[PDB]
Amino acid sequence: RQINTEYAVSLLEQLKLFYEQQLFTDIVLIVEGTEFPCHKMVLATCSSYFRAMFMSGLSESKQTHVHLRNVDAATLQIIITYAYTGNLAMNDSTVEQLYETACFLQVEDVLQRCREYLIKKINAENCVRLLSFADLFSCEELKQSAKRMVEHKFTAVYHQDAFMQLSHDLLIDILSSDNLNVEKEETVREAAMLWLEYNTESRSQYLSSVLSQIRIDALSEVTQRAWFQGLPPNDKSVVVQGLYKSMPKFFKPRLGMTKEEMMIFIEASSENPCSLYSSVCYSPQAEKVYKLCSPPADLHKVGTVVTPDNDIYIAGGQVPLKNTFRTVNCFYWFDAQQNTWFPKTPMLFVRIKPSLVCCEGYIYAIGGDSVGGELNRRTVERYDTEKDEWTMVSPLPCAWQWSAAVVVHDCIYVMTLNLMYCYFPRSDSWVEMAMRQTSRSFASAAAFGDKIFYIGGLSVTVEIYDVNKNEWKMAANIPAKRYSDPCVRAVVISNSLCVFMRETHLNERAKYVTYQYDLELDRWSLRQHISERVLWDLGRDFRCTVGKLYPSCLEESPWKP
């Protein structure tokens, strides 16, 4: 039995003290002239290479001084101090060299720690770099994660400097995969070309291999003429092998072309009584209802946000204590292919129904019951999508509840009962805006074009605001049946303003129908009526947002018409 109370801590601390005082040391590591006196026992128990270094009978087993090369001094020092105290304390810059030295020394625990740290830090730019790093040092988890991140982002960037310097096998795996998040088939062609234009006459065979990989759909466009311009002289059989890649090799449709603009819904009426809420989706064009997996599977009252790059995030929320609703500041992100939710850096305050707004690539969470007992109750907190951290900003002018916030013209706009403030990201300050003549709450707003459409409130209040004009005006009243309480939802659909409303009467069933609204007509034309045979009841606290999803990755929601 390992008694952790007395001996373990005391033994570890005394070993650390002996290391500090250079006591009972019998082996010293020479690293480019730097001396690291240490013990053989700790190296054997920590590293799987030092055990063979000191146990296997050779000339270095009986050697007081050992000249270990191809290792950095700082990395070896941090590995030794981790072995002597158990704390790694890794930064964000020296992770690559630390992992390389750990792999060379075969220290499993620090290898796993660095693997987890790297798999948690594939943010935006090191994806291709760490993918190449994992290709150099075999790491299945890192390889798969970096491959997915590359298939997600490089398909939208395809210009990274590090991407040019890649091995043939990794590039073939990337290109031949059917996970390319590209809505068009020419971008991958030009990416492959530019990968084969900066290094030509050196990778001509690999040029032919990538040419075959990109396949006929993009092979029949321009590649022949560009290659004729760039081919080496006196090349004949290369023409023969290039001409062959027209008929064969199974031309098939890709997966990234299925970016159907749909609607993501949360907190729906769960089918099985064992579950409370569920997240589902609706297809405006396919006229189908898809489902999504709950991010925590137990926590509710979350807020949604969609970046211009079509990303889904979940922040805040409350979960039942399950003693024998507590608020959690956790964060999550939705995978567009794996149909799962990978968590991210949690917030600093446990918010209830936060309002997340994206602007300038940053996620801004406005209000939502931060802690409630703040000295300055009207505060906010934003997110960094690149650095993966939360930065405090200028707080709210006035404290508001059940508010809504949108982004227009790269500016933060938050709407409340009657007031509105514009937050300047450049100066980090709030400027007073126009005041609504009607006091309505429990409503949301949509940022369509350059006009904010605040719909609903307690109703059918249609108050249109323009940034360039800075005024509030009414347009019309949405046609709804009397003796009902409509639930309005305003969102952009296919670059056209539309609404999604549900009417409920006494002893009557709910009806779902979306209307097409015109700017100059001030009328909601009947666009499409959602049939109850495909979509069932949603509820009251459901939310709506616009985003593109994959039908194959998701699954249809089974429900009897």
Binding site: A52, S56, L58, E60, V66, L68, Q106
Partner: protein, 201 residues
């Protein structure tokens, strides 16, 4: 890098391995070999290293132990076999250390047996399961066990060492050892006990 550099690295590694297998592991460095293995597997040339290791091991076995066992099939045959097995194990200790540093990545990527298992398999194929060594070992073990059963006492720890060697050579369980030992031994025991019962009745 260039093929010349990796060829020279492999040549020196093979020379070091042969020197180790020749009971001369005292004056040989370990850090240099580990660094060369690192720079060899790093450049994604593990297949060549594995093939060269297999070729070197099988050539060394066929040259040394196959000749030694056949040259002493009557003068301490089992003792020489046990000594050869012990020498092979004590060299494969360090061989497996280095090529197991290699094996981590190699068999977590290429899905093959480890170098210790490779050495065990090649030893089984080239020594124990030889066309002449196998039958001679079977005959001598049957003869000595029958003589022990007759009433006179012979060496017993040696048979335990041989059985343990065969069990380790199984490398998965009791697949090879059980057949190779028991089946001729089962038949010999069957005939012996049948004759004994016929005499006793």
């Amino acid at each position: 890098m260039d093929e010349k550099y990796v060829n020279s690295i492999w040549d020196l590694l093979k020379n070091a391995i042969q020197e180790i297998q020749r009971k001369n592991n005292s004056g040989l460095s370990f850090e240099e070999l580990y660094r060369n293995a690192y720079t060899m597997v790093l450049h994604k040339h593990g297949e060549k290293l594995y093939t060269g290791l297999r070729e070197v091991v099988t050539e060394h076995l066929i040259n040394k132990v196959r000749e030694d066992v056949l040259n002493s099939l009557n003068n301490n045959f089992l003792q020489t076999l046990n000594q050869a097995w012990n020498d092979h194990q004590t060299a494969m200790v360090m061989i497996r250390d280095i090529l197991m540093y290699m094996d981590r990545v190699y068999v977590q990527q290429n899905n093959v047996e480890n170098v210790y298992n490779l050495g065990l398999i090649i030893f089984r194929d080239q020594v124990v399961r030889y066309g002449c060594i196998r039958d001679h070992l079977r005959q001598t073990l049957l003869d000595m066990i029958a003589r022990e059963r007759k009433g006179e006492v012979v060496d017993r720890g040696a048979i335990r060492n041989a059985c343990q060697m065969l069990m380790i050579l199984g490398l998965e369980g009791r697949s090879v050892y059980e057949e190779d030992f028991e089946a001729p031994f089962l038949e010999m025991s069957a005939e012996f006990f049948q004759m004994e019962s016929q005499k006793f009745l």
